[PDB]
């Protein structure tokens with residue numbers, strides 16, 4: 001690969017030069033002969049695999065604190081190396097853990113919210129041993145992050161993987177999600193995305209209310225044990241009913257959503273250590289709710305019902321009745337959150353902030369990996385600045401990774 | 414390996430084998446994806462490229478290894494020897510052009526690929542000849558509003574010093590003017606080309622939607638200006654079916670999108686002049702042409718007429734005015750019986766086309782970044798469709814703007 005790669009913004013004509021890509025650690029799944037940029041996803045580590053990965057990260061850490069090659073650096077390397085030799089693993093210091101978490105976010109090419117990366121509250125839950133404790137740590141996370149509507153981003157990090165048979169896992173895909181129930185007649189009640197997880201919860205003993213917006217219980221696995229159910233205290237679950245500034249009837253749709261998006265099934269990888277349970281949270285971009293959660297056909301799918309109430313001509317697509325309904329729904333979402341003083345960002349502000357963030361990263365870091373397919377918002381793409389912005393995608397570590405759903409791999413005790 | 418692609422709405426999984434046939438690079442590597450980057454001869458090189466194309470041509474007509482296949486190959490080799498190049502048969506030219514369209518990863522309109530009217534203009538020698546072929550193209554393709562897809566193919570490149578080039582980026586475009594106050598009148602995307610035409614002697618009406626003259630270069634010579642006969646230029650006045658004030662905006666557009674600056678590559682041969690046309694997807698005009706910042710940039714004016722709250726962005730006033738503009742464009746063209754397609758119909762057709770290509774061809778190269786429409790993305794099926802992108806030949810390639818290469 002060449003040392004410099006340039007990206008252009010076709011709207012402002014700004015050219016940026018990327019050197020950071022040289023530090024790319026893993027495969028994209030693309031090759032010289034095929035691109036996989038629209039593909040969704042294109043037994044532990046050994047001693048000898050782990051030494052270079054740890055050293056890679058420790059060097060990076062001491063470089064960031066302007067202490068590279070120092071006595072402390074060399075001593076840290078020595079300590080880590082001896083630990084790997086005598087335990088087949090090592091323990092990050094609190095500083096390294098915080099650094100690592102923040103940089104995994106900073107490195108998330110698909111995240112448009114990264115201007116905020118350095119402001120992340122890191123909760124160290126490496127002393128956890130049980131599922132009740134995981135629940136305690138998660139309740140505190142939710143309360144702190146929610147902050148009565150003034151949301152603050154956070155992550156809670158559970159003990160790293162050891163032999164792979166003692167993994168800590170949050171089985172929920174987010175800490176807060178709505179149940180989906182498949183009906184005998186083929187119809188789905190609730191959120192069709194969560195039908196499987198809902199069924200698993202019901203099997204472990206959850207008594208479902210069988211409603212449209214039932215907050216799911218936490219299903220938590222500690223130390224490789226069977227997972228346990230806990231109900232989140234409802235006072236900790238901030239929710240927003242959806243209404244519209246102009247349409248009085250919109251409240252009658254009975255919509256609501258939760259304030260706190262909190263992804264809980266990703267793997268955090270730092271210096272070759274694997275944190276299989278690392279629930280993190282920030283706040284919502286409106287389109288995630290107004291376009292995807294609400295208007296996807298395999299989701300709540302409300303376009304038709306909203307369109308009917310708007311009295312739109314729904315017999316021609318070329319009337320763009322879908323597009324019209326889609327805008328209003330996204331207005332109602334933003335209006336509802338702002339009126340209830342719950343943090344949310346519209347897709348224009350967010351993309352504009354990201355362009356600023358990306359430019360700053362090119363200047364101070366030599367680049368900023370970004371996945372245009374994910375960064376561009378699901379509606380009104382070209383009237384946001386990121387549509388016009390060339391991006392380079394590559395994988396830096398520390399990183400957040402996907403992992404198999406735990407029910408697919410768990411050995412029941 | 415065989416690769417799978419999934420649609421996340423329908424869970425339909427298709428299997429790609431076609432990608433194994435490509436030999437041109439994408440610009441990506443194992444370590445860096447460049448899917449959002451806009452742009453990532455000798456006898457010696459010439460024959461195998463020619464040989465490959467003949468092979469696939471004769472393999473497509475179920476006569477691979479035939480006497481004619483063998484003879485044609487001999488014929489082509491002997492010709493590259495004795496002339497440093499070769500000439501495509503009519504049949505091959507038509508097949509080549511349809512397949513460049515078919516292999517065009519960014520085109521959402523490819524379900525139409527095999528219905529392409531091919532005009533062979535390889536006997537052209539002068540810019541006057543070019544003008545005549547182009548007038549015939551425009552007239553045939555416009556067809557009183559019932560548009561028909563077409564391509565006109567001018568002589569292939571020889572030495573680079575005798576290129577045929579259409580200097581216009583599209584046969585029909587509007588002028589853009591730099592005003593004394595630093596603002597732009599008309600289409601800002603065309604300000605450079607407009608000044609080149611003015612320098613050449615074109616008398617500008619200096620209005621908002623002035624049809625630019627053709628600038629035609631034959632055989633490496635200086636380009637010549639030509640006025641398209643007005644009666645051949647179909648235009649649509651944009652009005653809204655509910656907002657009776659929308660016509661007051663004075664917006665119009667042309668019916669015929671006819672891209673004229675690309676390069677058609679067939680069997681190693683280079684056609685630097687190959688203007689082609691189909692018809693519009695509404696968003697091209699209603700989202701990009703009208704609402705881009707660097708273009709007509711009408712969003713603000715429209716939202717004012719809609720009396721929207723424009724003090725905060727979270728009112729989505731931009732998004733509202735955008736949908737209304739695009740409704741107007743679709744309504745206007747349809748009311749005037751001018752062929753057009755909305756982005757829901759077009760993306761649906763594409764998903765169907767993809768399925769056809771996987772079934773009969775083992776794949777379909779597709780550029781998600783380009784296929785997904787610039788508005789209402791995830792409420793169209795292509796957003797949720799995984800795609801594989803790879804470069805197959807024959808193809809349409811970009812080429813440098815001719816005013817950067819030409820010595821006068």
Ligand code: HEM
Pocket residue numbers: 101105108110111112113114116120153154155280281282283284285288345350374400
């Ligand atoms: C603070 C406000 C934040 C905003 C506005 C934001 C915005 C977004 C959005 C809109 C996506 C696309 C996801 C989708 O469409 O489903 C995304 C992806 C992602 N974000 Fe952020 N985010 C924020 C905070 C965070 C934080 C705190 C972290 C981790 C510490 C994070 C890590 C990620 C990762 C790893 C992805 C990729 C998800 C995937 O591949 O499935 N984000 N972000």
Ligand code: HEM
Pocket residue numbers: 510514517519520521522523525529562563564689690691692693694697754759783809
């Ligand atoms: C018949 C109706 C057609 C429709 C509705 C259609 C639609 C589109 C659209 C919306 C684009 C994106 C272009 C942009 O946003 O600037 C595109 C790209 C493209 N189309 Fe089609 N198209 C049609 C016909 C054709 C024909 C007849 C050809 C050639 C014979 C063709 C070849 C291409 C190529 C090469 C591109 C990529 C150009 C680039 O990379 O800049 N299309 N098409």
Ligand SMILES: N#Cc1ccc(CCNCc2ccc3ccc(N)nc3c2)cc1
Pocket residue numbers: 113261263281282283284285288421
């Ligand atoms: N099928 C499927 C399928 C669809 C989406 C995803 C990824 C969803 N991740 C969403 C996500 C992740 C992190 C976020 C951080 C902040 C925020 N506001 N939203 C965030 C949203 C995976 C599988």
Ligand SMILES: N#Cc1ccc(CCNCc2ccc3ccc(N)nc3c2)cc1
Pocket residue numbers: 010522670672690691692693694697
């Ligand atoms: N700067 C810039 C810049 C902007 C756009 C493009 C690509 C333009 N291609 C437009 C294009 C090409 C072929 C088409 C075929 C049919 C159709 N309806 N539209 C079509 C539109 C290149 C450079």
Ligand SMILES: C[C@H](O)[C@H](O)[C@H]1CNc2nc(N)[nH]c(=O)c2N1
Pocket residue numbers: 037038039040373374375421796797798799800
């Ligand atoms: C097929 C395609 O890769 C898939 O639908 C992607 C497209 N871009 C996305 N972008 C975001 N932000 N979130 C998503 O879930 C997706 N889905």
Ligand SMILES: C[C@H](O)[C@H](O)[C@H]1CNc2nc(N)[nH]c(=O)c2N1
Pocket residue numbers: 010387388389390391448449450451782783784
């Ligand atoms: C940077 C990015 O590749 C560029 O803006 C592309 C994005 N996708 C596009 N898609 C279409 N259909 N047309 C375009 O001009 C572009 N522009």
Ligand SMILES: [Zn+2]
Pocket residue numbers: 030034035036037441442445446447448
């Ligand atoms: Zn790629």
